[PDB]
From Swiss-Prot, chains A, B:
GO terms for molecular function: host cell surface receptor binding; identical protein binding. Residues 164-234 are annotated as: Receptor-binding motif. It comes from the Viruses. The chain holds residues 261 to 1058 of 1255 of the full protein. GO terms for biological process: endocytosis involved in viral entry into host cell; fusion of virus membrane with host endosome membrane; fusion of virus membrane with host plasma membrane; membrane fusion; positive regulation of viral entry into host cell; receptor-mediated virion attachment to host cell; symbiont-mediated suppression of host innate immune response; symbiont-mediated-mediated suppression of host tetherin activity. This is Spike glycoprotein. Homotrimer; each monomer consists of a S1 and a S2 subunit. The resulting peplomers protrude from the virus surface as spikes. Binds to human and palm civet ACE2 and human CLEC4M/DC-SIGNR. Interacts with the accessory proteins 3a and 7a. Disulfide bonds join C18-C28, C63-C88, C106-C159, C207-C214. The cytoplasmic Cys-rich domain is palmitoylated. Spike glycoprotein is digested by cathepsin CTSL within endosomes. Specific enzymatic cleavages in vivo yield mature proteins. The precursor is processed into S1 and S2 by host cell furin or another cellular protease to yield the mature S1 and S2 proteins. Additionally, a second cleavage leads to the release of a fusion peptide after viral attachment to host cell receptor. One of its GO terms (cellular component) is host cell endoplasmic reticulum-Golgi intermediate compartment membrane. Keywords: Coiled coil, Disulfide bond, Fusion of virus membrane with host endosomal membrane, Fusion of virus membrane with host membrane, Glycoprotein, Host cell membrane, Host membrane, Host-virus interaction, Inhibition of host innate immune response by virus, Inhibition of host tetherin by virus, Lipoprotein, Membrane, Palmitate, Signal, Transmembrane, Transmembrane helix, Viral attachment to host cell, Viral envelope protein, Viral immunoevasion, Viral penetration into host cytoplasm, Virion, Virulence, Virus entry into host cell. Tor2 is the prototype of the virus isolated during the severe SARS outbreak in 2002-2003. GD03 has been isolated from the second mild SARS outbreak in winter 2003-2004. SZ3 has been isolated from palm civet, the presumed animal reservoir. The spike proteins from those three isolates display a strong affinity for palm civet ACE2 receptor, whereas only the Tor2 spike protein efficiently binds human ACE2. This may explain the high pathogenicity of Tor2 virus, whose spike is highly adapted to the human host. Residues 609-653 form a coiled coil. It is a single-pass type I membrane protein.
């Protein structure tokens, strides 16, 4: 089926069934009309079957089973005789469709086919034994039949078939012909034939009875009509299957993946005649690793080569919200775009079948692009696809440097005198969702017998709480180290225009009912989105507690300080009585543009918005991984706890626990990596929130968009926003 | 049971059984009286069952099975007739408690209940076939009954019941009434009824017999008294179970989690009447995902809402060694502390049942705290619990900034002239336990047949040695890079008072029998704590080899050098002939306080003590994860290798291998992360042991407790200790 949109006024609202549109597949993949900018979703792709090729323009013979099964006499079990069959029709189900066989056993991979036409080189074993002796012919048996007379291999492939003939092999006085060895020096080799007769002695000395510790190895078989079936003689037939090293028409096509069928292989691969070797003559089939693609023909032994049609596909897009679904597809790795056109001739729908086709096929290095084709010069890269190709409009199809030049060397310089001051930002994630799971509440929640099937796989299970709790200790340990490094929590000032320009909207202010720092709340409004033991622990530090730490940092003589900071970047006393109106004018006309940078959807918080999505995609996967099982009875054991007995529940629950436990085990290890990752980003910012002590340049990053001369910190949900300034000289230059 | 303390003089010594005290649970969790400072152990918590609610103030009828089972005639198998039953009592075990049915089959989830009272809408199928035809009614059958006459679904839920009546349906001449279809164009749909009769032709042409390739599709049934049971007619009844879309008293409580029971759900959740929707009328039950909490009443269809009582609990503590067990508990997320008080009214012991209760319940944001309640102003944070609350005495219940103020802007400065010099430390881990496991020795140790059940799951198994060995290569690669960067291993000096102050106890000295650097051995005494293939490889570099590297580094004109280092921090020639007595007096009175910092239990090596515990908790988990199995025969296969045959051992060993392998597989991936983590801490220290070249400030960390002016390295087991100094101006200031 598909999925839909229940509005929770209880309403069957609008929804999309996909596969009427490959655009709709992307909505069918993740979620509804909410759309990327305009980014991907890697989906699946295949190639549709057509056509068959088979073997054997050679054989014209079946074999006479009836001269074996409907025969007269069978040989001994101690002296067993094998019969060879070549060039026969393996129509054994006709021999199965009878009541001729009481016992019908097949071992290993011979208990698999039971109806299926294959090919081998059959050998047949035959003997006659008594009643209960039938089960003694198997891998791992006892009794002098198995121990001293006849024994299968322990990895043997064959079918054993048997019946009873009281009518012939049983006489009233006893068919005393066949014998059994009950005194033999040792066990049997697999398929060992014993036609010799030597009288036995337990010390191994060859001697002759009647004597003490010198006796006979062979006695006869009582085959009576007037006895029960355990003493009655049973005629046994054992088959064998050695390989060749159901009609047909071979008819090579070339033309192909997408079916082929000899024995030993069902070829889903291209045909090419082709090359190379012929010799072995263990021929053919050898690959790295076991991907059999050297094939002989049955008639011409022609060196056929198999290669599949096994490729993927990802869709590029624009934002479908603010652009009108200018959707193109990138077939991933089927580089023969003609073969992609051979899937789009009509062409039997390979494989994302929908009602949208195109005629603007562009082949690239990364497979082939379908939807547009525009060799161009303009358009700096937006949506990269690989191989130096991007997507802008749609269109694209190139990449840019890009791009300037310069004068050469001379005997002159670059003086430049007039300058500018920027303000620029950066965001740094510092904390994940400080989360926790209860092990015993995800695993079955409430069943006692689930817990009874839980106390003995090794109670690590608290480890999945314990190793997860080590995150939660180290999570808020980061926020301490990035923040709690002040010497004394100084108070805010009462003069917002502290000498230089202002502290408007980055100023812990009086009223100002909220905190503190209006631009914090310009950041704090930038977010998106207890049954199953699944919680999120609250962090240690709260947001106003965070904003208290940020507030004293803004304090840091303030014009004399910033001038002294400028002298570190290479100016003097003269840039004090020069600039102080223009500096604030350079300041105040810049910081308001931050207040008009955001909110314009802010366009750059995707660092932070990824982080909450790094958990929201994770946990919502885990809840979806709950109710999909395998164990193949249901998906919620609350039924099957009440359904089965305690005989077969533990068959199914222990299957069900393994799917739940391993997925949970997958989550913790998936969780720990980003815990290790963001801590590395924390220690990046932990250093970087020291420049932010004034605190001049590193050199030369932080930000690296000019020199430094100071910077300002802010706050953010699960993150830290900086405010880097600099000097930046303009031109002129005007120099020799 | 519990666990104890065997003193290894062979003595049954003192031990603790837990659950007489929630304090004792923490000792019952990890280990004995050894106690944290005073930190947690996250344990489990539940809510105790009480009360039941059930369905149906409606039905008053069972159904007449006896007019179906004890009836006269059954319809055909090619023309099968279904009978509908509504409003009956599903008392099928009474029909099971009989000898009326020879065959008793149930399929899918219908072979589960077999005694259990549930509800459905039963349909009944009935026919009469011959002897061996009973097994042909199943998912995946052959024969013209299954292929051409009647077929179940392959996912069907129902019970099939049958018997024999030679007394009625068998006559001496033959009950030739019912027929069988043996010539039909194609297979069957599931539950397809075939009441038509058209004579057959293999080319599909409608024609009329007697003609070549034009015959009849239906022949009769020989039902003889004078024949065997394989030809005798068997009467068959097939049941069906379609849903509704054992007595009772409904009696809504509201009041609740902690049991509820309709059909299709066993509600372990709160009751609230409540809201919202009514429409569908696929009603009710729909959640994200399948957490069914929309319920109708059987009478009033009232929109009941289910929410569980599923919460955890962690205990706070003081050090029980040096404080007198001032123990409080934090119930994790049951934020309704009244509901926690409703578990502590008396109240049927939910769920960590012990003999210790309290009456000082404080609700917080992180659930509810029980044990103390103290709204306060003092006490900077010690033991954080989250939501800005900590624990000191016990008590607590607040958080601090904390906390100062400052003067405002002016036309003055801060001159400060007198200064100080600190010494401060930091520790950096550089190496784990360089460990190794043998794969084949953890997995069964010594069994040949375990190895026979090991050679074919894909012999990665050396990979668990190989990927683990890649740690051990990269482990001691770190210690080279952090240390082996000297140009020439210079020798130690003979004058310990090398100009400035001294090198007392950080001085590779003559006698000094050990090395080198007395304060190394003040650090080296700060540690705590071959059957199962489980080793720890020795490191490359030894401790005296490490101390040799540290020794030449202390060398580094020495007063003129440290003065020139001071001039980098912003002083001149004048702070040479000013201070040289006071500097050593500032030096020597500070370094002895390091020699009185440690040992005071040293209070700060918990970085390094964690690292050995990061392995000691890991490996001791792994050894405990050995002897707890699941596979549910034993925990050591040395028994079951000698117990079973090679028929059922591979049933159990392959279950047993999977638990052992996956836990081992868990360990390596758990091991690799801290290998990646400490290497990041190594590259931190690898840079940081270059300042330590003199080697002035970064700026401004290393340490960041002042400027830099130099620093000293030391050595530590699996770690590196630094000695950062600085300048620090006092006051006065005294400036305008």
């Amino acid at each position: 089926t598909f999925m839909l949109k229940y509005d929770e006024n209880g309403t069957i609202t609008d929804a999309v069934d996909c596969s009427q549109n490959p655009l709709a597949e992307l909505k069918c993949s993740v979620k509804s009309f909410e759309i990327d900018k305009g980014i991907y979703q890697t989906s699946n792709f295949r190639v549709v079957p057509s056509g068959d090729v088979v073997r054997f323009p050679n054989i014209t013979n079946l074999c006479p089973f009836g001269e074996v099964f409907n025969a007269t006499k069978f040989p001994s079990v101690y002296a067993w005789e094998r019969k060879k069959i070549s060039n026969c029709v393996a129509d054994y189900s006709v021999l199965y469709n009878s009541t001729f066989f009481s016992t019908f056993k097949c071992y290993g991979v011979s208990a698999t086919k039971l109806n299926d036409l294959c090919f081998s080189n059959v050998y047949a074993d035959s003997f006659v034994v008594k009643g209960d002796d039938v089960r003694q012919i198997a891998p791992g048996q006892t009794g002098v039949i198995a121990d001293y007379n006849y024994k299968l291999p322990d990895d043997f492939m064959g079918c054993v078939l048997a019946w009873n003939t009281r009518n012939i092999d049983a006489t009233s006085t006893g068919n005393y012909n066949y014998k059994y060895r009950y005194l033999r020096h040792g066990k049997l080799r697999p398929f060992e034939r014993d036609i010799s007769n030597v009288p036995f002695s337990p010390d191994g000395k060859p001697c002759t009875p009647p004597a003490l510790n010198c006796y006979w190895p062979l006695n006869d078989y009582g085959f009576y009509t007037t006895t029960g079936i355990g003493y009655q003689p049973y005629r046994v037939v054992v088959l064998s299957f050695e390989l060749l090293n159901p009609k047909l028409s071979t008819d090579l096509i070339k033309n192909q993946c997408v079916n082929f069928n000899f024995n030993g292989l069902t070829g889903t691969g291209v045909l090419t005649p082709s090359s190379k070797r012929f010799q072995p003559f263990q021929q053919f089939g050898r690959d790295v690793s076991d991907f059999t693609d050297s094939v002989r023909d049955p008639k011409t032994s022609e060196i056929l080569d198999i290669s599949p049609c096994s490729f993927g596909g990802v869709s590029v897009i624009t934002p479908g919200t603010n652009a009108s679904s200018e959707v193109a597809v990138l077939y991933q790795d089927v580089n023969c775009t003609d073969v992609s056109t051979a899937i789009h001739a009509d062409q039997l729908t390979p494989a994302w079948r929908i009602y949208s086709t195109g005629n603007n096929v562009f082949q690239t290095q990364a497979g082939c692009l379908i939807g547009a084709e525009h060799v161009d010069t303009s358009y700096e890269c937006d949506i990269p696809i690989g191989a130096g190709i991007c997507a802008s409009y749609v269109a694209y199809t190139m990449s840019l440097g890009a791009d300037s030049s310069i004068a050469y060397s001379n005997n002159t310089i670059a003086i430049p005198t007039n300058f500018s001051i920027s303000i620029t930002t950066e965001v740094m994630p510092v904390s994940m969702a400080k989360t926790s799971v209860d092990c015993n509440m995800y695993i079955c929640g409430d069943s006692t017998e689930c817990a009874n099937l839980l106390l003995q796989y090794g109670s690590f299970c608290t480890q999945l709480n314990r190793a997860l709790s080590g995150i939660a200790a180290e999570q808020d340990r980061n926020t301490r180290e990035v923040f709690a490094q002040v010497k004394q929590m100084y108070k805010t000032p009462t003069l917002k225009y502290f000498g230089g320009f202002n502290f408007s909207q980055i100023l812990p202010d009086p009223l100002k009912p909220t905190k503190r720092s209006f631009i914090e709340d310009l950041l704090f409004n930038k977010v998106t989105l207890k049954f199953n033991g699944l919680t999120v622990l609250p962090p240690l530090l709260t947001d106003d507690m965070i904003a208290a730490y940020t507030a004293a940092l803004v304090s840091g003589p303030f014009a004399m300080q910033m001038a002294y900071r400028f002298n570190g970047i290479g100016v003097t006393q003269n840039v004090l009585y020069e600039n102080q109106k223009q500096i604030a004018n350079q300041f105040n006309k810049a910081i308001s543009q931050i207040q008009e940078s955001l909110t314009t959807t802010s366009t750059a918080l995707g660092k932070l918005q990824d982080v909450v999505n790094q958990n929201a995609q994770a946990l919502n996967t885990l809840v979806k991984q709950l109710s999909s099982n395998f164990g193949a009875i249901s998906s919620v054991l609350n039924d099957i706890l009440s359904r089965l007995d305690k005989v077969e529940a533990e068959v199914q629950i222990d299957r069900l626990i393994t799917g739940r436990l391993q997925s949970l085990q997958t989550y913790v290890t998936q969780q720990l990596i980003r815990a290790a990752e963001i801590r590395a980003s924390a220690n990046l910012a932990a250093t970087k929130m020291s420049e932010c002590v004034l605190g001049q340049s590193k050199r030369v990053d932080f930000c690296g968009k000019g020199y430094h001369l100071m910077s300002f910190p802010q706050a953010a949900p699960h993150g830290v926003v900086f405010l880097h300034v600099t000097y930046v000289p303009s031109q002129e230059r005007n120099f020799t």
